[PDB]
PDB file of all heavy atoms in Angstrom:
ATOM      1  N   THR X   1      26.043   2.587  35.217  1.00 42.12           N
ATOM      2  CA  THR X   1      26.458   1.804  36.400  1.00 42.12           C
ATOM      3  C   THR X   1      25.482   1.959  37.588  1.00 42.12           C
ATOM      4  O   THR X   1      24.288   1.759  37.352  1.00 42.12           O
ATOM      5  CB  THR X   1      27.968   1.898  36.833  1.00 42.12           C
ATOM      6  OG1 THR X   1      28.235   3.168  37.448  1.00 42.12           O
ATOM      7  CG2 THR X   1      28.992   1.900  35.716  1.00 42.12           C
ATOM      8  N   UNK X   2      25.897   2.437  38.783  1.00 42.82           N
ATOM      9  CA  UNK X   2      25.262   2.395  40.096  1.00 42.82           C
ATOM     10  C   UNK X   2      23.771   2.055  40.075  1.00 42.82           C
ATOM     11  O   UNK X   2      23.371   0.878  40.028  1.00 42.82           O
ATOM     12  CB  UNK X   2      26.203   1.627  41.099  1.00 42.82           C
ATOM     13  N   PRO X   3      22.925   3.112  40.082  1.00 41.66           N
ATOM     14  CA  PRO X   3      23.266   4.522  40.460  1.00 41.66           C
ATOM     15  C   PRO X   3      23.921   4.896  41.822  1.00 41.66           C
ATOM     16  O   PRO X   3      23.356   4.559  42.878  1.00 41.66           O
ATOM     17  CB  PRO X   3      21.939   5.287  40.229  1.00 41.66           C
ATOM     18  CG  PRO X   3      21.555   4.627  38.903  1.00 41.66           C
ATOM     19  CD  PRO X   3      21.745   3.142  39.202  1.00 41.66           C
ATOM     20  N   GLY X   4      25.106   5.572  41.885  1.00 40.49           N
ATOM     21  CA  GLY X   4      25.927   6.121  40.781  1.00 40.49           C
ATOM     22  C   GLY X   4      26.964   5.336  39.939  1.00 40.49           C
ATOM     23  O   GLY X   4      26.482   4.774  38.982  1.00 40.49           O
ATOM     24  N   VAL X   5      28.320   5.308  40.086  1.00 40.47           N
ATOM     25  CA  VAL X   5      29.365   4.505  39.318  1.00 40.47           C
ATOM     26  C   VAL X   5      29.019   3.152  38.601  1.00 40.47           C
ATOM     27  O   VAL X   5      29.579   2.066  38.863  1.00 40.47           O
ATOM     28  CB  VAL X   5      30.714   4.170  40.073  1.00 40.47           C
ATOM     29  CG1 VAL X   5      31.715   5.309  40.265  1.00 40.47           C
ATOM     30  CG2 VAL X   5      30.470   3.343  41.329  1.00 40.47           C
TER      31      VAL X   5
END
Side-chain angles (χ1 to χ4, degrees):
Chain X
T1 74
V5 286

